[PDB]
Amino acid sequence: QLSSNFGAISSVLNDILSRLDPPEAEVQIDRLITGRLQSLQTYVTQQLIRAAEIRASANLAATKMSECVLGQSKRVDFCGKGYHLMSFPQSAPHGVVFLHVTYVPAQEKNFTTAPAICHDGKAHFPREGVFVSNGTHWFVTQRNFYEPQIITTDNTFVSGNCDVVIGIVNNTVYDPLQPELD
Amino acid sequence: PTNFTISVTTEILPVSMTKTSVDCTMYICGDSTECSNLLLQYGSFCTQLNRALTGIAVEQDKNTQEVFAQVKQIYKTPPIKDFGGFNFSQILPDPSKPSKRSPIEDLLFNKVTLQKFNGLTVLPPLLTDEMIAQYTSALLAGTITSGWTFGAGPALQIPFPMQMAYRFNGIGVTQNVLYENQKLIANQFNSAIGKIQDSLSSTPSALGKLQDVVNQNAQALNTLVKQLSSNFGAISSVLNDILSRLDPPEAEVQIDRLITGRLQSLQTYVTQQLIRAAEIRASANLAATKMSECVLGQSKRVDFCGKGYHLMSFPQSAPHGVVFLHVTYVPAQEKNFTTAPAICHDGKAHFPREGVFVSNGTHWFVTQRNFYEPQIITTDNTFVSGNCDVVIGIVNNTVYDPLQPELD
Amino acid sequence: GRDIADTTDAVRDPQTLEILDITPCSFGGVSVITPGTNTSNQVAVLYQDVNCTEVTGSNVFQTRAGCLIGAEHVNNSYECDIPIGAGICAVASQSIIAYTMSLGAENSVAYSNNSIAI
Numbered sequence: 001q002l003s004s005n006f007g008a009i010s011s012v013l014n015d016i017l018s019r020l021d022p023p024e025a026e027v028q029i030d031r032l033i034t035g036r037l038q039s040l041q042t043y044v045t046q047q048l049i050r051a052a053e054i055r056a057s058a059n060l061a062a063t064k065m066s067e068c069v070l071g072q073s074k075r076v077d078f079c080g081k082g083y084h085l086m087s088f089p090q091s092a093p094h095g096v097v098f099l100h101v102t103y104v105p106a107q108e109k110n111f112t113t114a115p116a117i118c119h120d121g122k123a124h125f126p127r128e129g130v131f132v133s134n135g136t137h138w139f140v141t142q143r144n145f146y147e148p149q150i151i152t153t154d155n156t157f158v159s160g161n162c163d164v165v166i167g168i169v170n171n172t173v174y175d176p177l178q179p180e181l182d
Numbered sequence: 183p184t185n186f187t188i189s190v191t192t193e194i195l196p197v198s199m200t201k202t203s204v205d206c207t208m209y210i211c212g213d214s215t216e217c218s219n220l221l222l223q224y225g226s227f228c229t230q231l232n233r234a235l236t237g238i239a240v241e242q243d244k245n246t247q248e249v250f251a252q253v254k255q256i257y258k259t260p261p262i263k264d265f266g267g268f269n270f271s272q273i274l275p276d277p278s279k280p281s282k283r284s285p286i287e288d289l290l291f292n293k294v295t296l297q298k299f300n301g302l303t304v305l306p307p308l309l310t311d312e313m314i315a316q317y318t319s320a321l322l323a324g325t326i327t328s329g330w331t332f333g334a335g336p337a338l339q340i341p342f343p344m345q346m347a348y349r350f351n352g353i354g355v356t357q358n359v360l361y362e363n364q365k366l367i368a369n370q371f372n373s374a375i376g377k378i379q380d381s382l383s384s385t386p387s388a389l390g391k392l393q394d395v396v397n398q399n400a401q402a403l404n405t406l407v408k409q410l411s412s413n414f415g416a417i418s419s420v421l422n423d424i425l426s427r428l429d430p431p432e433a434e435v436q437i438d439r440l441i442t443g444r445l446q447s448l449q450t451y452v453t454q455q456l457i458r459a460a461e462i463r464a465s466a467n468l469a470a471t472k473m474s475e476c477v478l479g480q481s482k483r484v485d486f487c488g489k490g491y492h493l494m495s496f497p498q499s500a501p502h503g504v505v506f507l508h509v510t511y512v513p514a515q516e517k518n519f520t521t522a523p524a525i526c527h528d529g530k531a532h533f534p535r536e537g538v539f540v541s542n543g544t545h546w547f548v549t550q551r552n553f554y555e556p557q558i559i560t561t562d563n564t565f566v567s568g569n570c571d572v573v574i575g576i577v578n579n580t581v582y583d584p585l586q587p588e589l590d
Numbered sequence: 591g592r593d594i595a596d597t598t599d600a601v602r603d604p605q606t607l608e609i610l611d612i613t614p615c616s617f618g619g620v621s622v623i624t625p626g627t628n629t630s631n632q633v634a635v636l637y638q639d640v641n642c643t644e645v646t647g648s649n650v651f652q653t654r655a656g657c658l659i660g661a662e663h664v665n666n667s668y669e670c671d672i673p674i675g676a677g678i679c680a681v682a683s684q685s686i687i688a689y690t691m692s693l694g695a696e697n698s699v700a701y702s703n704n705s706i707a708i
């Protein structure tokens with residue numbers, strides 16, 4: 001922008017200064033002064049806005065470092081796609097790079113399920129996990145990995161009767177004390 | 183508490199603004215070569231403004247795409263609505279409409295109410311309204327059918343009452359409460375979502391956040407256009423009269439005054455637009471975060487996705503914004519009880535595993551914290567630790583064990 | 591009459607005392623779509639916010655954003671490559687093509703009231 005004329009005879013200040021009379025030089029220099037001041041002001045304002053944006057980005061990066069690298073985040077899609085495990089930082093020019101490590105399920109299957117199981121007139125619910133059946137028998141598994149287990153009084157609890165819940169099924173539960181009592 | 187209520191509340195967030203563009207040379211002095219030559223002595227002042235306007239115009243599309251493009255595939259709801267008693271008819275798309283928009287977002291589109299000048303144009307967004315509605319429909323179908331599973335890996339189906347039992351368990355209340363109050367919960371859900379349409383349609387100024395941006399943009403454009411009739415010191419405010427009436431050796435001054443005035447006006451407009459664009463970008467980032475954390479999962483942050491204990495959320499679309507429908511859980515009716523930190527039996531102090539000891543006046547029970555459900559005190563819900571001379575302020579009672587009645 | 595700005599919107603014709611409407615003539619930007627100098631030397635141009643009634647001179651195609659010249663409209667939809675505007679995107683099959691962007695593959699999950707996947 002220094003090479004612009006802004007309406008004077010010439011952009012270079014030495015030429016106008018040392019070719020015309022002083023009263024006209026004091027008039028021709030004002031145009032250059034005003035133009036250069038305007039250019040500087042524009043540059044400063046754009047720099048201020050850019051700095052604000054960069055500050056917001058830096059705050060986000062600091063928050064991500066604190067919450068993903070130093071702990072284990074439960075927020076969804078904050079430290080990677082999938083269930084979060086950990087993270088590793090790396091440096092870079094004017095920035096930082098995060099290497100998120102996640103857990104993704106795969107290779108699903110197809111089952112049938114019930115909300116409760118009715119035995120001896122009492123409704124049973126799973127302490128942790130779900131009820132599934134492979135076609136003939138009933139098991140108990142966790143939700144994020146298939147692992148069958150035999151229904152037992154240890155992993156189920158009883159509350160109420162069988163005349164309240166909808167979709168109850170009939171089956172049998174097993175108690176650890178049966179082999180000992182036998 | 184001994185009861186509860188399900189409540190639904192809304193939330194409005196702006197996303198984008200209109201993509202406008204102004205031509206420097208046409209605006210400052212059009213169809214005249216006797217001013218463009220004088221303007222060509224100032225440099226890149228007519229290039230920086232165009233660059234900035236192009237930047238904000240490009241940024242708006244990024245805002246929209248970040249907020250709404252969160253899904254991989256386009257899911258579809260089953261043709262039969264056997265959802266265990268729950269009714270989603272007010273948010274699912276209607277197939278009898280010319281445009282597949284749900285009734286609530288149809289009312290939203292009809293509620294908010296949104297020419298030619300010199301050198302000013304308006305650009306169309308890359309994503310049409312139909313595509314945004316389709317995106318929200320895909321999100322809503324996915325969250326209805328598969329829960330939060332479709333946000334982490336592949337979508338795995340699960341019956342809706344069982345998903346709601348899981349979400350009830352996620353706030354500290356056991357699932358048998360829902361399995362025993364399913365009909366009541368379904369009726370409360372239906373009534374609460376029914377009230378929303380009337381509340382939106384009858385309350386004025388419910389969508390002021392989305393009308394404010396339109397009003398501000400229109401006002402700025404109107405001021406910029408009206409600024410063309412000022413004099414700034416010349417003998418006439420129009421260029422053709424002075425140009426066709428005087429010699430250019432004299433008309434140079436009159437042209438220069440108008441040039442500098444109009445340039446200053448354009449600079450002011452561009453700076454204001456830049457600041458407003460930054461504000462809108464911050465709002466769009468917040469909306470994207472809220473979608474990711476409340477629609478694709480269950481949030482435990484306090485007062486982030488509603489006032490209460492969070493259960494789920496359902497998004498809806500709106501002109502230049504998004505609308506959320508947070509579903510929460512609120513306790514209703516309490517009572518007074520007497521408690522104790524421990525129970526002293528046989529010289530050993532017993533503490534509860536999950537819950538707090540309560541007494542109705544004569545006997546002692548164990549209950550969970552967020553719902554009254556008295557159970558007798560046994561060895562399967564209390565764990566022993568230490569003696570009775572350390573903990574301050576404990577009482578006496580009898581703790582039973584299931585082994586004794588079974589073995590005798 | 592006159593507009594909100596200091597411009598005349600209508601006039602009365604001398605020698606006949608008749609009223610003539612005034613409307614500014616068309617204008618707009620020009621855009622060039624290029625797949626890259628590393629791939630080909632073909633381009634398509636778009637005259638923004640003007641219709642194909644007026645004026646590189648190969649074909650004509652009227653979109654909501656302007657008159658697109660040099661690209662052939664097609665029916666099958668693909669993932670967007672070069673954004674043009676209003677749901678239209680745009681090298682494939684030795685030509686520049688214009689289509690409607692596609693949001694993604696359509697998938698349906700088998701919902702049932704006694705079925706689950708683990």
Ligand SMILES: *[C@@H]1O[C@H](CO)[C@@H](O[C@@H]2O[C@H](CO)[C@@H](O)[C@H](O)[C@H]2NC(C)=O)[C@H](O)[C@H]1NC(C)=O
Binds near residue numbers: 184
């Ligand atoms: C918990 O609150 C609900 C709603 O206030 C109660 O359900 C109401 O019960 C009365 C009396 O039977 C009925 O007349 C209302 O129609 C019910 N409301 C609804 C929406 O169904 C419920 O009874 C309360 N719980 C207890 C234990 O009293």
Ligand SMILES: *[C@@H]1O[C@H](CO)[C@@H](O[C@@H]2O[C@H](CO)[C@@H](O)[C@H](O)[C@H]2NC(C)=O)[C@H](O)[C@H]1NC(C)=O
Binds near residue numbers: 272
């Ligand atoms: C699910 O809710 C919808 C409400 O959107 C019910 O549709 C309403 O049905 C009543 C009675 O037939 C009509 O008077 C309303 O006009 C319907 N609403 C609309 C928007 O048309 C629907 O019936 C409910 N589902 C079931 C199975 O009852």
Ligand SMILES: *[C@@H]1O[C@H](CO)[C@@H](O[C@@H]2O[C@H](CO)[C@@H](O)[C@H](O)[C@H]2NC(C)=O)[C@H](O)[C@H]1NC(C)=O
Binds near residue numbers: 516517518
């Ligand atoms: C539990 O007991 C307290 C005190 O015994 C009850 O608080 C009183 O409520 C009444 C009704 O507004 C007031 O007039 C009294 O001044 C309150 N007492 C005190 C000490 O502030 C409280 O209402 C009871 N809980 C329930 C659910 O009834």
Ligand SMILES: *[C@@H]1O[C@H](CO)[C@@H](O[C@@H]2O[C@H](CO)[C@@H](O)[C@H](O)[C@H]2NC(C)=O)[C@H](O)[C@H]1NC(C)=O
Binds near residue numbers: 108109110700701
């Ligand atoms: C579980 O089984 C059901 C049916 O036994 C599967 O549903 C079918 O899926 C195919 C594949 O897209 C569709 O073409 C059929 O129309 C579906 N039928 C029904 C009745 O829904 C389902 O895909 C299986 N799930 C898994 C995870 O394998």
Ligand SMILES: *[C@@H]1O[C@H](CO)[C@@H](O)[C@H](O)[C@H]1NC(C)=O
Binds near residue numbers: 134135136137
């Ligand atoms: C289901 O699992 C049981 C294991 O106890 C097995 O005996 C049975 O054959 C299985 N059913 C089918 C259809 O494979």
Ligand SMILES: *[C@@H]1O[C@H](CO)[C@@H](O)[C@H](O)[C@H]1NC(C)=O
Binds near residue numbers: 166168703704
């Ligand atoms: C599932 O729906 C069918 C009707 O399509 C019904 O007969 C059956 O009882 C339902 N299952 C449960 C567990 O309610």
Ligand SMILES: *[C@@H]1O[C@H](CO)[C@@H](O)[C@H](O)[C@H]1NC(C)=O
Binds near residue numbers: 169170
């Ligand atoms: C379960 O067993 C009870 C008796 O023990 C019977 O009355 C009931 O009909 C059975 N349920 C089904 C679904 O057959």
Ligand SMILES: *[C@@H]1O[C@H](CO)[C@@H](O)[C@H](O)[C@H]1NC(C)=O
Binds near residue numbers: 543544
């Ligand atoms: C407290 O609970 C016991 C046990 O059921 C009952 O016998 C008694 O009547 C209850 N007292 C009151 C005031 O409800």
Ligand SMILES: *[C@@H]1O[C@H](CO)[C@@H](O)[C@H](O)[C@H]1NC(C)=O
Binds near residue numbers: 574575576
């Ligand atoms: C509660 O305060 C009363 C004051 O009258 C006191 O007598 C009692 O010991 C206190 N209870 C405990 C557990 O500190």
Ligand SMILES: *[C@@H]1O[C@H](CO)[C@@H](O)[C@H](O)[C@H]1NC(C)=O
Binds near residue numbers: 577
């Ligand atoms: C509990 O028992 C001990 C010893 O048997 C006794 O000193 C104490 O007073 C009893 N607590 C109450 C509240 O009576």
Ligand SMILES: *[C@@H]1O[C@H](CO)[C@@H](O)[C@H](O)[C@H]1NC(C)=O
Binds near residue numbers: 641642643
């Ligand atoms: C341009 O011509 C087409 C051809 O009929 C017409 O549909 C369109 O409306 C015209 N453009 C305008 C701005 O009227």
Ligand SMILES: *[C@@H]1O[C@H](CO)[C@@H](O)[C@H](O)[C@H]1NC(C)=O
Binds near residue numbers: 663664665
């Ligand atoms: C696209 O399909 C329509 C009818 O479905 C047809 O009229 C049109 O000619 C097709 N496009 C081309 C380029 O042939």
